[PDB]
């Protein structure tokens, strides 16, 4: 535990070696000094956010997505979902699909019939498991897609690499 203190007045930085304070701010004291200048930090701001709204700093490409598995894994829809974009797949609860790419943004590529499209990983469960358990593991809605952003702002001029649904399909129909 670091000690937590509170600011009783506004403090403006005079040097780049300082932190500004507003009355009421809450800080953790890292180092007290008899100089009267103390090294402190603001309480960390944390929370769950959509991966889709993030990009890495050294390149637009995610480094930890698993590779696609064209053979697929059998899964079933444990919550119904209506397609809003042309690269998504509509499913009723109970429909079986094959998952072929478990991307870290929550929108997995699945095969149904002979076409591919995206579907929320949160609304799928491996075939033959306990559906109620999957449903209780759902604690918020599906993450918004990057495609849902009207105009995204990136620090990279290169676009991130992601196969089109047609490319996924061409691989999918061939590599079972």
UniProtKB/Swiss-Prot annotation:
Residues 1-59, 70-129 form the SH3 domain. It is found in: Cytoplasm, Cytosol; Membrane. The modification Phosphoserine is found at residues 147-148, 164, 172. Changing residue 107 to R: Abolishes autoinhibition and promotes phospholipid binding. Residues 153-162 have a biased composition (Basic residues). Detected in peripheral blood monocytes and neutrophils (at protein level). Phosphorylated by PRKCD; phosphorylation induces activation of NCF1, leading to assembly and activation of the NADPH oxidase complex. The PX domain mediates interaction with phosphatidylinositol 3,4-bisphosphate and other anionic phospholipids. In the autoinhibited, unphosphorylated state an intramolecular interaction with the C-terminal SH3 domain precludes phospholipid binding and interaction with CYBA. Phosphorylation disrupts the autoinhibited state. It is linked to Granulomatous disease, chronic, autosomal recessive, 1: A form of chronic granulomatous disease, a primary immunodeficiency characterized by severe recurrent bacterial and fungal infections, along with manifestations of chronic granulomatous inflammation. It results from an impaired ability of phagocytes to mount a burst of reactive oxygen species in response to pathogens. Component of the phagocyte NADPH oxidase complex composed of an obligatory core heterodimer formed by the membrane proteins CYBA and CYBB and the cytosolic regulatory subunits NCF1/p47-phox, NCF2/p67-phox, NCF4/p40-phox and the small GTPase RAC1 or RAC2. Part of a cytosolic complex composed at least by NCF1, NCF2 and NCF4. Interacts (via C-terminus) with NCF2 (via the C-terminal SH3 domain). Interacts with NCF4. Interacts with CYBB. Interacts (via the second SH3 domain) with CYBA; interaction is phosphorylation-dependent. Interacts with NOXA1. Interacts with ADAM15. Interacts with TRAF4. Subunit of the phagocyte NADPH oxidase complex that mediates the transfer of electrons from cytosolic NADPH to O2 to produce the superoxide anion (O2(-)). In the activated complex, electrons are first transferred from NADPH to flavin adenine dinucleotide (FAD) and subsequently transferred via two heme molecules to molecular oxygen, producing superoxide through an outer-sphere reaction. This is Neutrophil cytosol factor 1. It comes from Homo sapiens. The lineage of its organism: Eukaryota, Metazoa, Chordata, Craniata, Vertebrata. The gene is NCF1.
């Amino acid at each position: 535990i670091l000690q937590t203190y509170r600011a009783i007045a506004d403090y403006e930085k005079t040097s780049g070696s300082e932190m500004a304070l507003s009355t009421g701010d809450v800080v953790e004291v890292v180092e007290k000094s008899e100089s009267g200048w103390w090294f402190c930090q603001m309480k960390a701001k944390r929370g769950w956010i959509p991966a889709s709204f993030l990009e890495p700093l050294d390149s637009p490409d995610e480094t930890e997505d698993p590779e696609p598995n064209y053979a697929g894994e059998p899964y079933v829809a444990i919550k119904a979902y209506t397609a809003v974009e042309g690269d998504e797949v509509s499913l009723l609860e109970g429909e079986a699909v094959e998952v072929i790419h478990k991307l870290l943004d929550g929108w997995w590529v699945i095969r149904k019939d002979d076409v591919t499209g995206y579907f929320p990983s949160m609304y799928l469960q491996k075939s033959g498991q306990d559906v109620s358990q999957a449903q209780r593991q759902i604690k918020r809605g599906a993450p918004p897609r990057r495609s849902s952003i009207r105009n995204a702002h990136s620090i990279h001029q290169r676009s991130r690499k992601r196969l089109s649904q047609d490319a996924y399909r061409r691989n999918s129909v061939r590599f079972l």
